[PDB]
Amino acid sequence: MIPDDEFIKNPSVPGPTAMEVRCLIMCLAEPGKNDVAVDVGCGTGGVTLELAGRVRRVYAIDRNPEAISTTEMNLQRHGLGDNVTLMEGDAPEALCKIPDIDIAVVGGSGGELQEILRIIKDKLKPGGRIIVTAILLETKFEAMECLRDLGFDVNITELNIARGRALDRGTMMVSRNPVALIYTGV
Template identity: 55%
Template sequence: MLEDMDFIKSCDVPGPTKEAIRAIILYKSDVKDSENVVDVGCGTGGITCEFAQRAKHVTSIDINPEAIEMTQKNLDKFDLGDNVTLICNDGAEALKDIEDIDIAIVGGSGKQLENILELIDSKLNSKGRIIVTAILVDTKVEAINKLKELNYNPNIMEVNISKGRVLDRGIMMMSENPIAIISAKKR
């Protein structure tokens, strides 16, 4: 796993997804080195970098040009990227041109989550997996409902990682990146 502190960050681009969250996403994805991954809403590229080390190919999408630039900088920093395609475009628009998806990670949808999930479903291989990360309650409900409508059996895990900070009088636990991880396999 890549360490959080090693990523290049920007106050204008979300991310990277915290290391413990990335580890859970990797575990839930059950990624193989023969699989193609799509990362919608890649931000600074934390998830992209992790999957680039493990998958056959990663396609990372973000509408924000600064996010694509940050993802490229992080790929370069970790000497990754030979198997990564970066696309600066709206997630739904970019997905129209992508085929052969084994795993789709949706971390940003620009208010188009239902449309994005429909597109992913139409391009997902027979044993494909979808993982949606969500902070807003509304996004969690929307993702679960859409996945059920598409005939998936979604699972949701609320994750709240806390790290300890040693003080003079004890240890204070500080929460980092509370997030829901919704995972579903194609039936």
């Protein structure tokens, strides 16, 4: 899978998300060449780039113009983006113009996490998956509470990753920052 260092970043644009995390988001998302997925807060584009090649169509949304721009750049360098619709705009309004979805990945909550999830539940085909990524503490709580309030079966997994860096003196373990995945069962 495309390792972190292989992605073009940006100052005002966070990401890419740790490969280990991206790897797990895909395992939970349970892709498919016939699935329609939406990725909110596509940021650097990691999550979008991955899905761009395992489903029918992916809607990448992000209020920050730089993010939509940053994702596009990576999509182009990897020659992907055919089944990807970029959307410059607020998440709630961006979602309303989209068909029902099979997969839903919500990155940077954007302080609109609750409203964002509410909408997603109204457009979730049967057996749909909803995966919420969280970097902020307050975000994990809100993600559990809302998804629960919408009648979903919420689960949460915290991932503390450490990779080894080759030094002259030997190998050192470099830590990533904690990343929790709040998701709904099938």
